[PDB]
Write a protein that binds this ligand. Structure first.
Ligand SMILES: [Mg+2]
Ligand SMILES: [Zn+2]
Ligand SMILES: [Zn+2]
Lengths: 93, 1099, 147, 129, 95, 293, 155
DNA sequence: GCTTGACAAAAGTGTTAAATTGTGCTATACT
C-alpha cells in the first residue's frame, strides 16, 4: 500500500510556473485595447473562471454576438502576432 | 584432470583423489526423478534395494485409492499416472512467460456396489511443471529453484532438563508424527494436568497389568496409586472433557475419540521416516505407546539397556534433535509430493460430497472430479512459497550453490525469529555433509547452509558421506556411503594419514574421529573407515578459496559469499592461482557447453556449434548470446573450439559467462602492491591503474528489461503509438512507426522507449490553458500521455524488442491488447565507488584510479594495477591473501629448480614434476593439501627475466617500486605480486540516488522510498535523536514538516527557492492529522485545545 | 581508431552469421590495432573478407596517408558462410579518449563508437649511476614504442 | 526516559553534592578513574587542606591543573556538584551539570543532556561482551 | 495555526460519534463493478464522505467552483475540494 | 486496583456508558483507499472487508428482528455482530484473527498505530524526506576537515530549484519551464551555475546506524567527478565509516535557521572531541599513526 | 534504597553501571550515567492520601507530590523504578503511546481523560512544533536583531 | 464600426426502447 503514488498531489514546479504563466498573460493582455482584453477574459473566463458565450459578452459591451465574434478574431491575430506570442511559447506543456 | 579437455593446471596436492566429486547438481535431479519416477529412477531402485519401487506420484495416489463414502456403496479408484511430452521448450517458455510443464493423465475408476457397474475414464489433472537439465523450473517464464528444507524427522525423542526449582531430574519425552496431534509425557494436544496413568487404563488395561508391566518403576505405581480414576471408561471421560471441552460425550464418542485420534490411519499419519525411526529405536500401535512409557521410566532410572516386554534390546539414552541422524532435509521431490497430497485431499472432499447430491448412475469419474484444488496447490507452491525462489544467477557459481542450499526455515519448519542459536551452531555430525564455513552473515546465520562436496541424500532424507573402510590397518578400495547414525558407530580415520607402499598404515598411530564426536589418537589397530579426502566438510565455493587453511573461518565465510557475488566480465580470465574445484564447478553448473558424444566439429559460428559424432549422429548447440540474467548480469557464451577440432565426450565446447577454458573465472589476475599510498587506499579503500579502464579488464555488461502493456480501459482502448500529445519532434526522433524505440538507439534518463496513450475526460481545461490553445492553435488532445521512459540515472543502447499483440494471434490476459518489452544494455567500466574483493574475504571500494604514468612501477617500468593498504591485512587473519599474492607472482614469471645436483630439502615432501613451470602457467593448491610455506620460499627466488635478465622480485616477495609521481624510488622494498580479485554486484551507478521533489504516498503524503519511485531518504528515529542532541530545532522541524508531510508547505518552499524569497513558516504534518483520524475511528475523542478557545478544527 | 561501422550490425551486442567472434569480442580485438596517420581530419579505412579464412589487420586496406604496423593481428575467424564488411575511422590525438557516444557526436544509429588509445609508447623505465667524492649523476632511460 | 532533560538555567545555587574519592592512601596515587568522576565537575564547597588554606574555591572547573594542585595539599576527597543533587525546578542547571565534553567549557543553556547521556551510554554497547 | 497548547482524549460517546459523522453508511458496497464509481450509501459514497473530484458532484449538474458549499439537489453531493474525502467520517447505527 | 478504574470515572465527566457502542464510527475513505494499480487490477485496504462484515451482520440483525425470530437465531446474530466489531478494532485480540486469502490476518484499526511499522515509529518519529540523496563513500584524503566530495550529478538534483532560479537570473533561460529542461538534459551551462549556488551552502552527512549525534555532521560541499562521495578521513571514527562499501545519506538544509545550525552547531571542524569522554575523535588513526610514528 | 536511602542508591547504580563499561575498556563520564539514574528516583509511593486526591500504591512525581501535599493547613516513601516503567509514568500520554504498549496506554488515557500539555520534545516532534531544547528554547528563538545606529550611519 | 438574416453545428430536452438489476421461487427425503 505504501508504494502507490498520489496522482492528484500538487506538483510544486507546475503550480509555480502556472503562477508565472498567470503573470505573463496579465502582462500580454495589457498590450491590448481595454475592450480587446476585456473580451478575451470573459470569452475564456479568466477572471471568473466561467467562460461566456458570444451573445453574453455582447450583452456587457452592448453589441451583437457577431460583433464580438469579429473583435475576437482580430485580437487573436494580434495575440498570434509574434511579439506577443514569443514569450508564451515555452508554456506549451 | 580426468576431464577430456581439462586445461593443464599443476597441483601441489600430496594425496590422490580416490573418488571423483559426484555430480553436484544431483540432489535436485534425483529428488525430482523419484517424484515422477521415470525409468531412470526405476533402474536405480531395481538394481539395488527394494523390489517394489513406488514413485512419489503413485505413492500419493495409493493413499487416495479408493474413495468410498460411509456407505461403501460407491468407490472411486485412481491409478496409472501418465505424462505427455513437454508443451513447449525451456527457451520458448522463458520468452513467452509460460511455465515449463508436462500434462498429467490418470485412470479414474468409479464403481457402484449396488449396481456392480464400472465406469473407467481418463482424467486430465493439469500441467505439471517439470525440471530442467540444470535442476530448475520455469514458472511463468522466470527460472526458479526449490531449496531443500531441514526438518525434525518423525520419531520419539527424549530430553532431560534439570528442574528450574527442585533441581531434580525430569523427562520430558515427545513424539512428533507426520500429521496429527502430538503428545508429551500424558500432556496431549497442549492440555496440561494429565497423568500418564489415566490413559494407560483408557485402552482397557486393568490395574494389575500396570503393576505387572510397570514393575521396577516406582513412580509408575505411585502415579496409579495417586490417580483417582476408577475404571477404564471413567478415565476416557476425564480425557474427553479435557480434549473436547464444551461437548457432552457419548459412549460411542468416548471410545472412538482415542481410537480415531492416533490408531486410525486417516487422522494420524504414520510416516515412513517415523515408522522407521521408532520401529528400530523401540500407524501407531498400542504396542508402541506402551514401549514409549517403558523407554521413559528406564531413562530416568539410569539404565542404558531396555529389553521390551517381548521386544528386542536397544540403548536407552537421550536423543539430540541437532544430530543429522534425526534431521532431514525434505528434498524438492518431497516438497512437491506434500503439496500434491494437499491438493488431492481437498479434491477428495468434493469427490465424497459430490456422490451424495449427484443423481446416482449419472455420476462418472469426471463428474465427481474437479481439479481446481490440485493444480492450485502446485501453482500456489511455486509462487508465494519461501522454498521456491528465483534462481540466483550473476555467475555460474551463484546458481550452483543456490541449488544445494539447505535451510531450516519455511512451512513445516521453525520460524527465523523463534529458533535459538543451538540449531545455528555446527554439530559434529555436519562433517562431510553440510559445510560449516558457508552461511549468510545476516540473521540467517546457521539456518541456511550448503551441502558438502561429496555429501549425498538418502531415499529417506538423511545426508550420507562417502568413506573408505579400513580393515587391519589397511584401507581398501571399498567406498561405503554412511548416514550420521552409522557414522557414530565406527572410527573414521583422518583423510591424510601416511600411505604405505601398496597401501596400509605407515604412521605408528592413526588420527580418528569418535562418536562424540570426540577426536582421539589410537594406533592403526582399531580403525574401521577413513575419509575419502580432505575438504569433505567443505562446500563447492569454500573449496574454491586458495590457501583456505590459512584464513580464519570469519573471513572465509565472507570469501565464499562474495564469490557468488561477482559479476561476469567481458573478457573472463581464469585464476592464476587456483584450487581443485574451478574445473568441475563450471561444468556441473550448466553455464558451459559440453559435448555428449565423441566426434568432430562440423561448424563453429558465434550462433551455434555442430559436431559430427563417430556415431554418425549429428548434435548441435545454440549459444546463449548477451542473455539478460535474473539480476541483470550477462550470460554471453563463446566457442572455445575450431572447425577441424577433434573432441571427446564430456569436453567443453564453449565458455560460459564467468568461465575460461572450462574452469570458473570469477575475476582477473592483477599486479598488486601492498604499500600504503598517500592516504588514498585507506580504511579498506583500493586504488587502481587507469589501465583497468583503457583495457577493459574489469569491464562488464548489464541489461535491463522494460515493460509496458496496452489494455482495454472503461473509456476506450489504450493504443501504442508514435503520436504524443505534447512533445517536440526531437524526443520522437528515435521512435519508429509504431512508437517503440529503434534497435541500436542510444537512450538517456527520461528518454521515450514505448509511446502509449490512454483516453481522458471530461477534461475541463484551465482557462489559462484554453487561451494558449486558441493562440497557438493546438487542439487539446482527446487522450492523456502515459508512456514508457527510461528510469532516472540509467542509460545504454537498445538491444532487442519483443512485441506481443492481440491483433496478432499471440496471447494475453483478458484486457491486454499489446505487450512490448525493450531490452537496454550498457558496458560498465570499472568505476570509483565500485566494490572489489578477493576470495579471502578482503573487500573494498575503489577509492581512486590513477593515470598509469604515476603509479608504483617496477624496475621494468611495469606499473602496478592495484595498491592494497598494508594495515587491513594483519589484524583480519586472512593472510592467505598474501600467500596467493606470492604464488601469483610465481605462476606469472615461471621458475626452475633447485637441481642439480640433488633436489633441495624443502622440495622432498614433495613437489613432483613441479620442478619447472614456464611463465604464465596456472597453479592449483587444493584447500587442505596445498603448497606449503617451505615450498613457497624455494619458489620465490625464480626466475628472470622481465625480458633482460634482471629479476623483479626477491625471495621475500618484494620489489623496489618507483613513485610515478616524484620519480624517486620508495625507500623500502615493497611486496608485489599477482592477486585474483573479483568485481562485485554492488555498483555505484545503481547505488547513487538523489531527490529534490518527487512522488508522494497516497495515505501519508511522505515521499516514498526506493529508486524505482525516485524516492527520498528516511530520516529515522535515531537520526532525530542525533538532531535533538545537537539542539537544532529548525533543522529537525524542517525535515519533518516542509521536507516531507506538509502538503501546502512543501509547495510553498519550492515557490520560495525559485523566487529567491525567504523560506516560509512550516505547517502541520499530514501524518499527524491522520493519527487524530485513526484515533477517532477507535471511539477515542481526541481534541486539540489551544490555551483556549478549546477545540481547534483540523481542516 | 575512433569508430567503426559494420553493415549487418546496428549495434555492438549482436553476432554476425558464420563469424566465430561476437561483435563485442571483435571490438576488443580491434583495440590492439596499432595504427599511424598523417591525419589531420578523420579518414575511414575499409575491410571486406569473404569465404573461410582468418581475418587480420593485413586485410585492412588503409587509405592514402595511413598505415597499419602489425598486420599479423588476429581480428575474426570466418567460415564458409562468414562475411565481414566493416569500415574503420582513424582520427589523430593523444592519450586515452573514451568512446564518444554518437548522441554527443552527430552520428547515426549505425556507428559503433570505440575507446581510442593514442599511445605510440609501450613500456618505459630508467635508472641512474653516480658519475666516491666528486660524484655526479648519469641516467639511462629505456624507451620502447609500439612501432 | 532521559529525552526531556535539558539545561534550563545557569545555577540552582544548592550547596548539595556528592563526594568523589580522588585517590587515597599514598604515597606511604591517583584513583584509577578520576577522569570520569572528579574531572569536568564543579566544586560544591571550598577544598581545604589542614588546617587550612582553601586550595580551590567552590565553583571551580576542576581541570587537570586543579587535580595536581589539590593532590599536593593532600585532599583525599572533594564534594562535587551533580545532576543527582541539583534542585532546579525544571531540567537541570549548568553549574550542577558541569563542563560540556564536546566544547570543553560550561554546558550551554540549550543543551539537551538526557539524549546525549542516552547516546553516550548506548553507543559503546556494541563493544560490551 | 501550528501552536496548540493541550491535546486531550476521552471516551467517545455514541453522540460524539454521531456528531462527527457526515452520514450513516447503510450498505456493504464499495464501488460499482461496471462504472467503478462509488456506490451510494455504501462505503466511499460521495453523498456522505465527499466528492471524488474538486467542485464536482456525482452527477455533475453543478460542476464549477462558482458555487462552493452548495449540495446537488439530485445526487446530494456537496461541491468542494475532494480533499474533504480525507477528512470526513461516517457512522453505523447498530441494531 | 479496582478503585483506580472506578475513581478515574468520577473525576472526569466521562460516562462509563462509553464502553458500550450504540454507533461505530467509519474512517474516511482515502485512509482506507481502493485504487487500481497500473494495469487495472484493484487493491484496497483490509479495513473495508472488516467494515463489510460489521454492516452485513448489523443489517441481517435488523431483518431477523423485524420478522421475529427465536432467540437462538437472533442471539447468534448479536454474538456475530459483537465479534465483527472486535475484529474491526483489534483483530485476533480475542480468538483466531479474521483472515483473507492465503490465511493472512486482516489489519485492524489497532494494527495501524502499533509496532515499528505503525504510525508512530514509521510515519511520525521518522519519515522519508525531500532534498536528500545517498551514494557509496570513498576516501577524502585531500579534503579540508570542513569539506566533502559531492557527486556532481547528485549535487545537481539536490540543488535543482536553486540553480533553476540562478540560470533564470543570469539570462541563460528565459522562463522557469526552460530552466527546468536545461537542468534535466544537463546542458553544459548549468555546471558553472551549480558551483555558484553550492558555494558556502552546507549539507548534512549521515551514516546508519546513527549511534551518537556525531553520526550526522555538516560539511562544505565540493563538486566531484564520479558517482561516489568523498569523505574526509578524520570523520570515519565518528561515523564508524568503513570504506568496504558503506553508503551515506546527504541532506540539504534549506531555511536560514537550518543553514545556521549546520554551520555553527553541526559543522565538522567544531565537533572534534567525543561528547561522552571528551577524548579527541578526529585525532589521527591507522595510516596516520604509523606515518607520524 | 530502603536501607541506605535515596541518594545512596544513585551512588551504587552509577558504580555498578560504570563497572561493566570499565571492564570492556569504555570511558563514560559519570554525569551521563547520573542523568539516567536521576530519572529512576523521581517518584514516591503514596501510602496515605490522606485528604488527597492521590491513591495508595500509586507512583507520583516528587515535586508534584510535595506541592499539592502541602494543601496549606499524605505520606510516601522514595521509590526506585526501572527506566521502562519510569517512561511509561510520564505525563505526556502521546509520548507514552509512541513508546510501547500503545493499546494499554490509549485505553488508560481515555478513561482518565488525560490532557497533554505538549511540553516535552518528543510530543513537539510528532506534531511538528519546535522542540523545547537548543535553539527552540524561548530565550533563543525570541531574540530580536537590529543593526546599531552607529552601524547604520556608516551604511 | 457595427447589424441583419440565413444557416448549420452544437447543445439540451423530452419520449421510448433496450439493457440492466432485484427478488421470488423450485414439494421423494435429506437435520
Ligand atoms: Mg561496513
Ligand atoms: Zn543545579
Ligand atoms: Zn449532482
Amino acid at each position: 500500500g505504501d508504494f502507490i503514488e498520489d496522482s492528484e498531489a500538487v506538483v510544486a514546479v507546475d503550480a509555480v510556473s502556472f503562477t508565472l504563466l498567470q503573470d505573463q498573460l496579465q502582462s500580454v493582455l495589457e498590450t491590448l485595447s481595454e475592450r480587446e482584453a476585456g473580451v478575451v477574459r470573459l470569452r475564456f473566463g479568466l477572471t471568473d473562471g466561467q467562460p461566456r458565450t458570444l451573445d453574453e459578452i455582447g450583452q456587457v459591451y452592448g453589441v451583437t454576438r457577431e460583433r464580438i465574434r469579429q473583435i475576437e478574431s482580430k485580437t487573436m491575430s494580434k495575440l498570434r502576432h509574434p511579439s506577443r506570442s514569443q514569450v508564451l511559447r515555452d508554456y506549451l506543456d | 584432470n580426468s576431464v577430456p579437455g581439462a586445461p593443464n593446471r599443476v597441483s601441489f596436492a600430496k594425496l590422490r583423489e580416490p573418488l571423483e566429486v559426484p555430480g553436484l547438481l544431483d540432489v535436485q535431479t534425483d529428488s525430482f526423478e523419484w517424484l515422477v519416477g521415470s525409468d531412470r529412477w526405476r533402474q536405480a531402485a531395481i538394481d539395488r534395494g527394494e523390489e517394489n519401487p513406488v514413485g512419489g506420484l503413485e505413492e500419493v495416489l495409493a493413499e487416495l485409492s479408493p474413495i468410498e463414502d460411509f456407505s461403501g456403496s460407491m468407490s472411486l479408484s485412481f491409478s496409472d499416472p501418465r505424462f505427455d511430452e513437454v508443451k513447449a521448450s525451456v527457451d520458448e517458455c522463458k520468452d513467452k512467460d509460460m511455465t515449463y510443464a508436462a500434462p498429467l493423465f490418470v485412470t479414474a475408476e468409479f464403481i457402484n456396489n449396488n449396481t456392480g457397474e464400472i465406469k473407467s475414464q481418463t482424467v486430465f489433472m493439469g500441467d505439471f511443471p517439470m525440471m530442467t537439465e540444470k535442476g530448475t523450473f520455469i514458472i511463468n517464464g522466470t527460472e526458479r529453484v526449490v531449496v531443500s528444507q531441514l526438518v525434525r524427522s518423525p520419531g520419539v525423542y527424549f530430553d532431560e532438563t534439570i528442574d528450574k526449582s527442585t533441581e531434580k531430574t525430569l523427562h520430558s519425552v515427545k513424539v512428533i508424527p507426520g500429521r496429527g496431534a502430538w503428545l508429551e509425557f500424558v500432556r496431549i494436544d497442549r492440555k496440561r494436568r494429565q497423568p500418564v496413568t489415566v490413559l494407560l487404563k483408557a485402552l482397557g488395561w486393568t490395574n494389575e497389568q500396570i503393576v505387572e508391566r510397570f514393575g521396577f518403576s516406582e513412580i509408575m505405581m505411585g502415579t496409579l496409586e495417586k490417580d483417582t480414576t476408577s475404571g477404564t471408561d471413567e478415565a476416557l471421560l476425564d480425557i474427553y472433557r479435557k480434549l473436547r471441552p464444551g461437548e457432552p460425550p457419548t459412549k460411542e464418542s468416548a471410545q472412538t475419540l482415542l481410537e480415531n485420534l492416533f490408531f486410525k490411519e486417516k487422522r494420524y499419519d504414520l510416516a515412513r521416516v517415523g515408522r522407521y525411526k521408532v520401529n528400530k529405536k523401540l500407524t501407531l500401535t498400542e504396542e508402541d505407546v506402551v514401549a514409549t512409557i517403558e523407554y521413559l521410566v528406564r531413562l530416568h532410572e539410569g539404565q542404558t539397556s531396555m529389553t521390551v516386554p517381548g521386544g528386542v534390546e536397544v540403548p536407552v539414552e537421550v536423543d539430540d534433535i541437532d544430530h543429522f541422524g534425526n534431521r532431514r532435509l525434505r528434498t524438492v521431490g518431497e516438497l512437491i509430493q506434500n503439496q500434491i497430497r494437499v491438493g488431492l485431499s481437498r479434491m477428495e472432499r468434493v469427490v465424497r460430497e459430490r456422490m451424495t447430491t449427484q443423481d446416482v448412475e449419472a455420476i462418472t469419474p469426471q463428474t465427481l472430479i474437479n481439479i481446481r484444488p490440485v493444480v492450485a496447490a502446485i501453482k500456489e507452491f511455486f509462487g508465494t512459497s519461501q522454498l521456491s525462489q528465483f534462481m540466483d544467477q550473476n555467475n555460474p557459481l551463484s546458481g550452483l550453490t543456490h541449488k544445494r542450499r539447505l535451510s531450516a526455515l519455511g512451512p513445516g519448519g521453525l520460524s527465523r525469529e523463534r529458533a535459538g542459536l543451538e540449531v545455528r551452531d555446527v554439530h559434529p555430525s555436519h562433517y562431510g555433509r553440510m559445510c560449516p564455513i558457508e552461511t549468510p552473515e545476516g540473521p540467517n546465520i546457521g539456518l541456511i547452509g550448503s551441502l558438502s562436496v561429496y555429501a549425498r541424500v538418502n531415499p529417506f532424507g538423511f545426508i550420507e558421506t562417502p568413506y573408505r573402510k579400513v580393515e587391519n590397518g589397511v584401507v581398501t578400495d571399498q567406498i561405503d556411503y554412511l548416514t550420521a547414525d552409522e557414522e557414530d558407530r565406527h572410527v573414521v580415520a583422518q583423510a591424510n594419514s601416511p600411505t604405505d607402499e601398496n597401501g596400509r598404515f605407515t604412521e605408528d598411530r592413526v588420527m580418528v574421529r569418535k562418536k562424540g564426536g570426540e577426536v582421539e589418537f589410537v594406533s592403526a589397530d582399531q580403525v574401521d573407515y577413513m575419509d575419502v579426502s580432505p575438504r569433505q566438510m567443505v562446500s563447492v565455493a569454500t573449496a574454491m578459496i586458495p590457501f583456505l587453511e590459512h584464513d580464519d573461518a570469519n573471513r572465509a565465510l565472507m570469501g565464499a559469499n562474495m564469490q557468488r557475488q561477482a559479476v561476469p566480465l567481458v573478457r573472463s580470465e581464469a585464476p592464476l592461482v587456483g584450487t581443485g574445484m574451478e574445473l568441475r564447478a563450471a561444468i556441473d553448473a550448466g553455464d558451459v557447453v559440453v559435448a555428449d558424444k565423441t566426434g568432430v566439429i562440423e561448424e563453429v559460428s558465434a550462433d551455434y556449434i555442430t559436431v559430427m559424432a563417430d556415431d554418425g549422429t549429428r548434435q548441435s548447440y545454440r549459444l546463449r548470446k548477451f542473455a539478460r540474467s535474473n539480476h541483470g548480469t550477462c550470460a554471453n557464451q563463446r566457442p572455445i573450439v575450431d572447425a577441424g577440432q577433434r573432441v571427446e565426450a564430456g569436453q567443453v565446447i564453449a565458455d560460459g559467462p564467468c568461465t575460461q577454458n572450462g574452469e570458473m573465472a570469477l575475476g582477473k589476475n592483477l599486479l598488486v602492491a601492498i604499500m600504503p599510498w598517500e592516504g588514498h587506499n585507506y580504511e579498506d579503500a583500493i586504488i587502481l591503474s587507469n589501465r583497468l579502464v583503457e583495457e577493459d579488464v574489469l569491464t562488464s555488461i548489464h541489461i535491463e528489461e522494460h515493460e509496458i502493456d496496452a489494455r482495454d480501459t472503461k473509456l476506450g482502448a489504450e493504443e501504442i503509438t508514435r503520436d504524443i500529445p505534447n512533445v517536440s519532434d526531437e524526443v520522437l526522433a528515435d521512435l519508429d512507426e509504431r512508437g517503440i524505440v529503434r534497435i541500436g538507439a542510444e537512450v538517456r534518463d527520461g528518454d521515450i522507449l514505448v509511446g502509449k496513450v490512454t483516453p481522458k475526460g471530461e477534461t475541463e481545461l484551465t482557462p489559462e490553458e484554453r487561451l494558449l490553445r486558441a493562440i497557438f492553435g493546438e487542439k487539446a488532445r482527446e487522450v492523456r500521455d502515459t508512456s514508457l521512459k527510461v528510469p532516472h540515472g540509467e542509460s545504454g543502447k537498445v538491444i532487442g524488442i519483443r512485441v506481443f499483440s492481440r491483433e496478432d494471434d499471440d496471447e494475453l490476459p483478458a484486457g491486454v491488447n499489446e505487450l512490448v518489452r525493450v531490452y537496454v544494455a550498457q558496458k560498465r567500466k570499472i568505476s570509483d565507488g565500485d566494490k572489489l574483493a578477493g576470495r579471502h574475504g578482503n573487500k573494498g571500494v575503489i577509492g581512486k584510479i590513477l593515470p598509469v604514468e604515476d603509479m608504483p612501477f617496477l624496475p621494468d617500468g611495469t606499473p602496478v594495477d592495484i595498491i592494497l593498504n598494508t594495515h587491513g591485512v594483519p589484524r583480519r587473519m586472512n593472510i592467505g591473501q598474501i600467500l596467493e599474492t606470492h604464488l601469483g607472482w610465481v605462476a606469472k614469471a615461471g621458475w626452475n629448480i633447485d637441481v642439480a645436483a640433488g633436489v633441495p630439502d624443502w622440495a622432498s615432501k614433495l613437489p613432483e614434476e613441479l620442478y619447472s613451470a614456464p611463465a604464465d602457467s596456472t597453479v592449483a593448491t587444493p584447500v587442505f593439501d596445498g603448497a606449503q610455506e617451505g615450498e613457497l620460499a624455494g619458489l620465490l627466488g625464480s626466475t628472470l627475466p622481465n625480458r633482460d635478465g634482471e629479476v623483479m622480485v626477491d625471495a621475500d616477495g618484494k620489489s623496489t617500486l618507483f613513485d610515478g609521481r616524484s620519480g624517486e624510488p620508495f625507500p623500502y622494498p615493497v611486496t608485489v605480486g599477482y592477486m585474483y580479485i573479483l568485481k562485485l554486484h554492488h555498483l555505484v551507478d545503481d547505488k547513487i540516488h538523489a531527490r529534490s521533489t518527487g512522488p508522494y504516498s497516497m495515505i501519508t503524503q511522505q515521499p516514498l522510498g526506493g529508486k524505482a519511485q525516485f524516492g527520498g531518504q528516511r530520516f529515522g528515529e535515531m537520526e532525530c535523536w542525533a538532531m535533538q542532541a545537537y539542539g537544532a530545532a529548525y533543522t529537525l522541524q524542517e525535515l519533518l514538516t516542509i521536507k516531507s508531510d506538509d502538503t501546502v508547505g512543501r509547495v510553498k518552499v519550492y515557490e520560495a527557492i525559485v523566487k529567491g524569497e525567504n523560506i516560509p513558516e512550516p505547517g502541520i504534518p499530514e501524518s499527524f492529522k491522520v493519527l487524530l483520524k485513526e484515533l477517532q475511528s477507535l471511539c477515542l475523542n481526541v481534541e486539540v485545545l489551544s490555551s483556549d478557545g478549546a477545540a481547534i478544527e483540523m481542516r | 581508431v575512433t569508430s567503426i561501422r559494420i553493415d549487418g550490425v546496428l549495434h555492438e551486442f549482436t553476432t554476425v552469421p558464420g563469424v566465430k567472434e561476437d561483435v563485442t569480442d571483435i571490438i576488443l580485438n580491434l583495440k590492439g590495432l596499432v595504427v599511424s596517420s598523417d591525419d589531420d581530419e578523420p579518414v575511414t579505412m575499409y575491410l571486406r573478407k569473404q569465404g573461410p579464412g582468418v581475418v587480420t589487420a593485413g586485410d585492412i586496406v588503409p587509405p592514402a596517408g595511413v598505415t597499419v604496423h602489425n598486420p599479423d593481428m588476429h581480428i575474426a575467424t570466418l567460415n564458409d558462410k562468414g562475411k565481414l564488411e566493416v569500415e574503420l575511422v582513424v582520427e589523430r590525438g593523444r592519450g586515452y579518449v573514451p568512446a564518444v557516444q554518437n548522441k554527443a557526436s552527430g552520428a547515426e544509429i549505425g556507428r559503433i563508437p570505440v575507446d581510442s588509445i593514442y599511445s605510440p609508447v609501450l613500456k618505459v623505465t630508467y635508472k641512474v649511476e653516480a658519475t666516491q667524492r666528486t660524484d655526479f649523476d648519469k641516467l639511462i632511460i629505456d624507451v620502447e614504442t609500439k612501432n | 526516559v532521559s529525552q526531556d532533560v535539558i539545561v534550563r538555567e545557569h545555577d540552582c545555587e544548592t550547596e548539595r553534592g556528592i563526594n568523589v574519592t580522588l585517590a587515597e592512601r599514598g604515597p606511604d596515587i591517583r584513583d584509577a578513574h578520576v577522569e570520569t568522576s572528579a574531572f569536568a565537575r564543579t566544586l560544591a564547597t571550598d577544598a581545604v587542606d589542614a588546617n587550612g588554606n582553601v586550595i580551590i574555591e567552590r565553583g571551580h572547573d576542576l581541570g587537570d591543573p586543579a587535580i595536581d594542585a589539590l593532590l599536593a595539599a593532600g585532599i583525599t576527597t572533594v564534594k562535587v556538584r551533580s545532576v543527582l543533587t541539583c534542585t532546579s525546578a525544571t531540567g537541570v542547571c549548568a553549574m550542577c551539570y558541569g563542563r560540556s565534553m564536546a566544547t570543553g567549557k560550561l554546558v550551554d543553556i540549550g543543551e539537551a543532556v538526557g539524549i546525549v547521556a542516552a547516546q553516550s551510554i548506548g553507543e559503546p554497547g556494541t563493544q560490551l561482551t | 495555526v501550528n501552536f496548540f497548547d493541550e491535546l486531550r482524549i476521552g471516551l467517545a460517546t455514541a453522540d460524539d460519534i454521531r456528531n462527527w459523522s457526515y452520514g450513516e453508511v447503510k450498505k456493504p458496497e464499495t464501488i460499482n463493478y461496471r462504472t467503478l464509481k462509488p456506490e451510494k450509501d455504501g462505503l466511499f459514497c460521495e453523498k456522505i464522505f465527499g466528492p471524488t473530484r474538486d467542485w464536482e458532484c456525482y452527477c455533475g449538474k453543478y460542476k464549477r467552483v462558482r458555487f462552493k458549499g452548495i449540495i446537488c439537489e439530485r445526487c446530494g453531493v456537496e461541491v468542494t475540494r475532494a480533499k474533504v474525502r480525507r477528512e470526513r467520517m461516517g457512522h453505523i447505527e447498530l441494531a | 486496583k479496582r478503585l483506580k478504574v472506578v475513581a478515574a470515572f468520577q473525576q472526569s465527566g466521562n460516562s462509563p456508558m462509553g464502553m458500550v457502542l450504540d454507533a461505530v464510527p467509519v474512517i474516511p475513505p482515502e485512509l482506507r483507499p481502493m485504487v487500481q494499480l497500473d494495469g487495472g487490477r484493484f487493491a484496497t485496504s483490509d479495513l473495508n472487508d472488516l467494515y463489510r462484515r460489521v454492516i452485513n451482520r448489523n443489517n441481517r440483525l435488523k431483518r431477523l428482528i423485524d420478522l421475529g425470530a427465536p432467540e437462538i437465531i437472533v442471539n447468534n446474530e448479536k454474538r456475530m455482530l459483537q465479534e465483527s466489531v472486535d475484529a474491526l478494532f483489534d483483530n485476533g485480540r480475542r480468538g483466531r484473527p479474521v483472515t483473507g486469502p492465503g490465511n493472512r490476518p486482516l489489519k485492524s484499526l489497532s494494527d495501524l498505530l502499533k509496532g515499528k511499522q505503525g504510525r508512530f515509529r514509521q510515519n511520525l518519529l521518522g519519515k522519508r524526506v525531500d532534498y536528500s540523496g545517498r551514494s557509496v563513500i570513498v576516501v577524502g584524503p585531500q579534503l579540508k576537515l570542513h569539506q566533502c566530495g559531492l557527486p556532481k550529478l547528485m549535487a545537481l538534483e539536490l540543488f535543482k530549484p536553486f540553480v533553476m532560479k540562478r540560470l533564470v537570473d543570469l539570462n541563460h533561460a528565459q522562463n522557469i519551464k526552460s530552466a527546468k529542461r536545461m537542468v534535466e538534459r544537463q546542458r553544459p551551462q548549468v555546471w558553472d551555475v551549480l558551483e555558484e549556488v553550492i558555494a558556502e551552502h552546507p549539507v548534512l552527512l549521515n551514516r546508519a546506524p546513527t549511534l551518537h549525534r556525531l553520526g550526522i555532521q555538516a560539511f562544505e560541499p565540493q563538486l566531484v567527478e564520479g558517482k561516489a562521495i568523498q569523505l574526509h578521513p578524520l570523520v570515519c571514527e565518528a561515523f564508524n565509516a568503513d570504506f568496504d562499501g558503506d553508503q551515506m545519506a546527504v541532506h540539504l538544509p534549506l531555511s536560514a535557521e537550518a543553514q545556521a545550525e549546520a554551520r555553527i552547531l553541526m559543522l565538522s571542524s567544531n565537533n572534534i572531541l567525543s561528547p561522552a569522554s571528551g577524548k579527541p575523535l578526529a585525532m589521527p588513526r591507522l595510516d596516520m599513526v604509523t606515518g607520524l610514528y | 534504597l530502603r536501607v541506605q536511602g535515596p541518594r545512596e542508591v544513585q551512588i551504587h547504580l552509577v558504580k555498578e553501571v560504570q563497572e561493566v563499561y570499565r571492564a570492556q575498556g569504555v570511558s563514560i563520564h559519570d554525569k551521563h550515567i547520573e542523568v539516567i539514574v536521576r530519572q529512576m528516583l523521581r517518584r514516591v509511593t503514596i501510602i496515605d492520601s490522606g485528604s488527597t486526591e492521590f491513591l495508595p500504591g500509586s507512583l507520583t512525581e516528587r515535586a508534584e507530590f510535595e506541592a499539592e501535599n502541602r494543601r496549606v493547613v499524605a505520606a510516601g516513601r522514595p521509590v526506585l523504578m526501572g527506566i521502562t516503567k519510569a517512561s511509561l509514568a510520564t505525563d505526556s500520554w502521546l509520548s507514552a503511546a509512541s513508546f510501547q504498549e500503545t493499546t494499554r496506554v490509549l485505553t488508560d488515557a481515555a478513561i482518565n481523560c488525560r490532557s497533554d500539555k505538549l511540553n516535552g520534545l518528543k510530543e513537539n516532534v510528532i506534531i511538528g512544533k519546535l522542540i523545547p531544547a537548543g535553539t527552540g528554547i524561548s530565550r533563543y528563538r525570541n531574540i530580536q536583531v537590529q543593526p546599531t545606529e552607529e552601524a547604520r550611519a556608516a551604511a
